[PDB]
Amino acid sequence: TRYAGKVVVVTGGGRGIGAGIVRAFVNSGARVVICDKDESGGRALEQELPGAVFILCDVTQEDDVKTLVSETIRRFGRLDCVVNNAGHHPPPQRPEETSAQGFRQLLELNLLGTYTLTKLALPYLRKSQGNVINISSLVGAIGQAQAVPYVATKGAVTAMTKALALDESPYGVRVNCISPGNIWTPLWEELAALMPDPRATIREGMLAQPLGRMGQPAEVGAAAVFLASEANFCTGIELLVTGGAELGYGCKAPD
Amino acid sequence: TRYAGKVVVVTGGGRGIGAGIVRAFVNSGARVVICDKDESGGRALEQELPGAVFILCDVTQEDDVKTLVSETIRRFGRLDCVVNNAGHHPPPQRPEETSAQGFRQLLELNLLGTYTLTKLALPYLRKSQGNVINISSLVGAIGQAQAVPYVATKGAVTAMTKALALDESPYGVRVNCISPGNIWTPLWEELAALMPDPRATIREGMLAQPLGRMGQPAEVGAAAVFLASEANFCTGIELLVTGGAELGYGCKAPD
Amino acid sequence: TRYAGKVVVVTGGGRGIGAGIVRAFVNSGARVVICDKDESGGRALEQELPGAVFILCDVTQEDDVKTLVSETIRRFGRLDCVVNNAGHHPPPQRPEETSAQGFRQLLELNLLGTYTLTKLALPYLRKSQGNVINISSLVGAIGQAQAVPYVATKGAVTAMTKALALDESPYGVRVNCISPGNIWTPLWEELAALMPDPRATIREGMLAQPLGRMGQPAEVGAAAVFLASEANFCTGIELLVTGGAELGYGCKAPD
Amino acid sequence: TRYAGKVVVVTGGGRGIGAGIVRAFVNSGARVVICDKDESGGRALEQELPGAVFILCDVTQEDDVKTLVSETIRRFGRLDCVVNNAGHHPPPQRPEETSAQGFRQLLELNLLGTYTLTKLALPYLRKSQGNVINISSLVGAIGQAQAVPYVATKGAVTAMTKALALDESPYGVRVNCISPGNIWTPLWEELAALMPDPRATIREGMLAQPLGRMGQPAEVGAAAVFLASEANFCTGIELLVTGGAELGYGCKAPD
């Protein structure tokens, strides 16, 4: 009952981290709108979970997002929390293999889609003293190899979270982000499957964490529910869900 | 029921943040041991809360802490979480007004008392795959005026949290800290009461936060319960409970 | 003679921070190419400084940047350092007053122009074991009010610096950024001139720093020369030139 | 001539990082006082370098430090910069192998010795608008394995730097720190020599840096000279000299 009577929109909610966050909010008593650009995962989740419904919506299409918000209000009467989870990590790319145009397209999903849904939802969040939760990445803060565009988009999301927190604090609307590290999702599986030795790449990923495993969507989901329902003095924070990967010295390559 | 069947020790649990953390864990289903060097607050809390009991213990006295741990095991059979909250902020002191000896004494409470209880408890935490929660401070990270010794002790606690997280991760024991900002407690009230204009000093404190108020012990308590009971992929993190005070530009004093 | 025999390109070098960085490198013995989209400041600087020359170039125009690099090599035979300083801060804008299209345009200057010149220059920097210096902002790290797009662009530049540092470290090319705080430049003057009380706005800006003044272009310039010429074990760092504005509590707005 | 006419005290100046910093300041035109508790390195450096002199002084002995300051003034007439470099890293120690008393002793050197010389020197630094430079460590910020006491002492030094910067900014005295990563010094050599496979331990240390080597005392020295002589808008900063070890994912140990 931690978030009973509340209404939550989760973008990219059809699989992976997004689906874990959907399940965490339903388990807390909330009604959830699943936004995804793909029908398959999200429609099945709608049938599985009483309290969850699916709305097809590509967050890079402004008119899809407008409809997403107006249907959430029409069907449920309020809006309390937006979770900006939709995003993509391209396959590893050397810097000279990137293009300005590929970079713009990635900014369009990972940064501007978050911006657009946040903007269209804030009027309703102000009425409910609701809150925004953005899913950034640890690599926005510490960097990552062969991912200059991805890393730059997540640096922007984390910084944007802090700016918007400042602007919305007079209106009682909190704005926070979660920076996951290696979480085991279908995207992680798909990227590993492209590599010469998928299993070695997955072993590498597990051991980047002092805890020796990757994280789960449910753990990101629990962090989200905490920010929504219990972190009433937290705004502009970056909550790390990484298993300790940012800690200590490692293998990154006498004087 | 989030932490039902679990056993928690909270130091400095007799008032303020500590008492808020006690109440949050009892509300989550846990049995709580209240450690304090003063009898008055903690003994009343024992009578108020079924599931909480009080043990007199000065965390700077190694034999007090040994007894604290051995009695917790004798009375309850396990130990799942230690919350190192006991600590002190001296009145504002200019750097030339401090002494090496006053600095050592403050290190004794704010740093070594945390170290000692953590050390004596870890054998039992390893058996339970338990966890450690240290209460540091935002000012360890950003600094504070007229508090060189205090600030240095909290910088040490935050760094120590990360080192210990590294060492204990192979054994499944998580180690995290919470860095509160301005929280309204009897210590805050006592320091304000020493100033020329107490009410102006309290107004200043409220407005250091974008949210325009100070935080509450219950909010620190909710953050603690989250780290204990739900943050299973978090270790070595610093969870900010500050109301946004670290964000943006302020008044800190053409080219 | 700290950077004698070296060749440096500075974007936005015609006034402000950029012109200060130009002067610092000429004073260190280097030959400098001044890139700017406006002729007036940069052409005068060319006549003033032996060792500096001016090339008209809009960093958002890919063919301008290609020509910038190919002329630097044709005229001087090598390229040792690129300083990505060109950028803009819009007037203060509430979040609901921003647009996706204005945000894209700002990303085009502050982020993609840096990306494009870095990309076209890296082949030559690899040959010289040269280095990249990006001019980000403190507000990328701590946020700023009424500047969601600006803040997001500088968060991206700081994160991008760390990713590129990773990728270029095997080739001996260092990549670092400087995050200035309030520096007194014609842009600062222009923004203050838009406000109801320009002088009060400038007083506010000075007092956001513990040092009680704003910074100077020459101080950013000295930091740049240090990174280029002497910081041979520094890569991926963010060098703060802020006067302490990120330190301590301030005025950002009982429990 | 960058620091000509200036007078600098360097603690632990007899070898390693300290000796590198001594040489960097002499090369910049300054007169340097070498403080060390051991005679051998520092006395030879006095004979080697015109402009450097040696004063035996254990920074944990308050009366040694008082004499250090009063002799610097008596012999040279002013004091412009203090570099708090003296410090120690114990051999790797598991947390249950540490003691409260060993922890206190390490705090005495790495933290309180810095505090004491800073305190006795500040009157003279105020007269000269001088500055303080503390040598902390990257591991204060990111943690390190088997070094809970060491890590906590450096967390304290970095935080103390920011607090003191705040307090001294009205008087025009800047206070900054350098956080080196793996630097190749006699202490590094001595610790490696204790390990089962010294050469493997040294290879590990080199590859913790994206740059693939350890740093040199001269590079820390150049960073020090920059902070003293050219970073007039920098206070309370932490200048990383680490070769990128804090960047990206590494080896720190499916969901």
Ligand SMILES: NC(=O)c1ccc[n+]([C@@H]2O[C@H](COP(=O)([O-])OP(=O)(O)OC[C@H]3O[C@@H](n4cnc5c(N)ncnc54)[C@H](O)[C@@H]3O)[C@@H](O)[C@H]2O)c1
């Ligand atoms: N997996 C990790 O290790 C990891 C780590 C850090 C951050 N993240 C972030 O977490 C988020 C989710 O990652 P994931 O691993 O679960 O990914 P995923 O690919 O497994 O699932 C992402 C979901 O978002 C949807 N989506 C993609 N583009 C969309 C669009 N334009 N409109 C609507 N929905 C869209 C997909 O259809 C999919 O259902 C992303 O923002 C990612 O950057 C992931």
Ligand SMILES: NC(=O)c1ccc[n+]([C@@H]2O[C@H](COP(=O)([O-])OP(=O)(O)OC[C@H]3O[C@@H](n4cnc5c(N)ncnc54)[C@H](O)[C@@H]3O)[C@@H](O)[C@H]2O)c1
């Ligand atoms: N109040 C704030 O704004 C704030 C902000 C940041 C951090 N903190 C930290 O939070 C913690 C609690 O602060 P608070 O404001 O509630 O303080 P408080 O003074 O109101 O209460 C602290 C409690 O700890 C007890 N205590 C003190 N010394 C002890 C010892 N040696 N052994 C056992 N118990 C001891 C006291 O008796 C008291 O019951 C401290 O570690 C403090 O540094 C507080």
Ligand SMILES: NC(=O)c1ccc[n+]([C@@H]2O[C@H](COP(=O)([O-])OP(=O)(O)OC[C@H]3O[C@@H](n4cnc5c(N)ncnc54)[C@H](O)[C@@H]3O)[C@@H](O)[C@H]2O)c1
């Ligand atoms: N002034 C500050 O307080 C401050 C603080 C933090 C960061 N910064 C950053 O420092 C940099 C310089 O700022 P400033 O205050 O000197 O600004 P400024 O406006 O005074 O000068 C910027 C220069 O860049 C040029 N420029 C703009 N767009 C360009 C383009 N497309 N191509 C080429 N040149 C272009 C302008 O013509 C001008 O000569 C910017 O990146 C800014 O974000 C400034």
Ligand SMILES: NC(=O)c1ccc[n+]([C@@H]2O[C@H](COP(=O)([O-])OP(=O)(O)OC[C@H]3O[C@@H](n4cnc5c(N)ncnc54)[C@H](O)[C@@H]3O)[C@@H](O)[C@H]2O)c1
């Ligand atoms: N070597 C590294 O990788 C590294 C990395 C990060 C930080 N550091 C820090 O750099 C500093 C210097 O380290 P180093 O590797 O050159 O060490 P080092 O052992 O090689 O030399 C340190 C010097 O300090 C002197 N010293 C020790 N105790 C003293 C005391 N009580 N009074 C006066 N002098 C004293 C020693 O006699 C010696 O000459 C230390 O503060 C250390 O924590 C070193």
Ligand SMILES: NCC(=O)Nc1ccc2ccc(C(=O)c3ccc(F)c(O)c3)nc2c1
């Ligand atoms: N270039 C070496 C190399 O094998 N890189 C690889 C290989 C496989 C991966 C699988 C998934 C992810 C991923 O999406 C990801 C990971 C961490 C993040 F913090 C984050 O935001 C995203 N990254 C991978 C990176």
Ligand SMILES: NCC(=O)Nc1ccc2ccc(C(=O)c3ccc(F)c(O)c3)nc2c1
């Ligand atoms: N020197 C100006 C001045 O009036 N300072 C003052 C005045 C009154 C205070 C009342 C309480 C506290 C306090 O305990 C505290 C605050 C914030 C922290 F992050 C933290 O760890 C502790 N600090 C105060 C600081």
Ligand SMILES: NCC(=O)Nc1ccc2ccc(C(=O)c3ccc(F)c(O)c3)nc2c1
């Ligand atoms: N919304 C209150 C309000 O008066 N804001 C204002 C008013 C005037 C300014 C003048 C200039 C700047 C500026 O360009 C700037 C400053 C700091 C940065 F770290 C940075 O990257 C850029 N910012 C200003 C911000």
Ligand SMILES: NCC(=O)Nc1ccc2ccc(C(=O)c3ccc(F)c(O)c3)nc2c1
């Ligand atoms: N426990 C594994 C293990 O072999 N650790 C080891 C082994 C050998 C070392 C040699 C020297 C140093 C050292 O003094 C040091 C290094 C980095 C720092 F940022 C810093 O402040 C200090 N640390 C070492 C750590």
Ligand code: NA
């Ligand atoms: Na349903």
Ligand code: NA
């Ligand atoms: Na009870």
Ligand code: NA
């Ligand atoms: Na010229």
Ligand code: NA
């Ligand atoms: Na000499």
